[PDB]
């Protein structure tokens, strides 16, 4: 069982490194697709539902405005995300199908996940039962075991970044802030509620920050709100570093003990960062009923299946004003994005 995980991760690393060293490029073009709907909008891009003309398949298409990417200093993060997405392979990571660029934009075409974000379902239902939360948590544990074995720190875990697919399983999608680093790194980044204290305190930090963020996610899924909140981020940071946290009275004793070890300010003591590594988490009493292989194989019956009315249904996404997708007559920012 243990040697099986070792052998799996070794093969996974060999495959990842081959694709990392020789990324794919320019595997489709814009007029292969019809636009259906804007699913999301950000400061330098949008995510669209599109239909592939030849096949009729639906996909999500992330469209990034190269000039806005440069303006907002996102060149390296954008190239990094695409390089990671074309190299990884894991059941809970969204699949990149095509990428290409034109005079104005960068395009990443991914499997469409019609269930939408965990965030929306969590806010709607209020909170998840502990079995429901544990089902999702197990998928994140396995995903971080995979990513960390590739020396990738994820750094932006939150319900907003987790999609729910038609079988009720999670898909991670966005990797701009991920970093392939084996030792320490120093960048201040992430989302305030999910920041580990060592990031806030300007320390050199490591993959343990992802296990802290798992603790925040488990707490938020099971309570309906995160462990540390306040009006403004500066105020959230003081609570995080304090190393004080309260639990709803309905939290089980096992859940509280797990969260005390994940939400551990002393990264010399935090679960996931000790000699037994991820196994301190997998073998914890809260996960006693978890069949780790069956989760990986997606054989476990999901506790929740999103409403699904067709291959291009968008009902689980917010509505946005549809804006033009302009492609300039002039090539923009060619040198910056030559590797894309």
């Amino acid at each position: 069982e243990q040697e099986s995980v070792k052998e799996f991760l070794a093969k996974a690393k060999e495959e990842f490194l081959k694709k990392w060293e020789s990324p794919s490029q320019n595997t489709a073009q814009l007029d292969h697709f019809d636009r259906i709907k804007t699913l999301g909008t950000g400061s330098f891009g949008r995510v669209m539902l599109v239909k592939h003309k030849e096949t009729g398949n639906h996909y999500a298409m992330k469209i990034l405005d190269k000039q806005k990417v440069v303006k907002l200093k996102q060149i390296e993060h954008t190239l990094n995300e695409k390089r990671i997405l074309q190299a990884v392979n894991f059941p809970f990571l969204v699949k990149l199908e095509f990428s290409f660029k034109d005079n104005s934009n960068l395009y990443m075409v991914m499997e469409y996940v019609p269930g939408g974000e965990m965030f929306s379902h969590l806010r709607r239902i209020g909170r998840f039962s502990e079995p429901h939360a544990r089902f999702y948590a197990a998928q994140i544990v396995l995903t971080f075991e995979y990513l960390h074995s590739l020396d990738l720190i994820y750094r932006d875990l939150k319900p907003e970044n987790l999609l729910i697919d038609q079988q009720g399983y999670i898909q991670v999608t966005d990797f701009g802030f991920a970093k392939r680093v084996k030792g320490r790194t120093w960048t201040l980044c992430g989302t305030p509620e999910y920041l580990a204290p060592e990031i806030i305190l300007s320390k050199g930090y490591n993959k343990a920050v992802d296990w802290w963020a798992l603790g925040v996610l488990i707490y938020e899924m099971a309570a309906g709100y995160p462990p540390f909140f306040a009006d403004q981020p500066i105020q959230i940071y003081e609570k995080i570093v304090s190393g004080k946290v309260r639990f709803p009275s309905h939290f089980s004793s096992d859940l509280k003990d797990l969260l005390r070890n994940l939400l551990q300010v002393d990264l010399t003591k935090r679960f996931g960062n000790l000699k037994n590594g991820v196994n301190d988490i997998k073998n914890h009493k809260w996960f006693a009923t978890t069949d780790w292989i069956a989760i990986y194989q997606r054989k476990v019956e999901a506790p929740f299946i999103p409403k699904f009315k067709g291959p291009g249904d968008t009902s689980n996404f917010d509505d946005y004003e549809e804006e033009e997708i302009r492609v300039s007559i002039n090539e923009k920012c060619g040198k910056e994005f030559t590797e894309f």
Partner: peptide, 18 residues
């Protein structure tokens, strides 16, 4: 309640990265 405090925080919608 803690829930009421959460609603009062104003950070109940989608959260941006730093």
């Amino acid at each position: 309640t803690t829930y009421a405090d959460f609603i009062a925080s104003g950070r109940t919608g989608r959260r941006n990265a730093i």
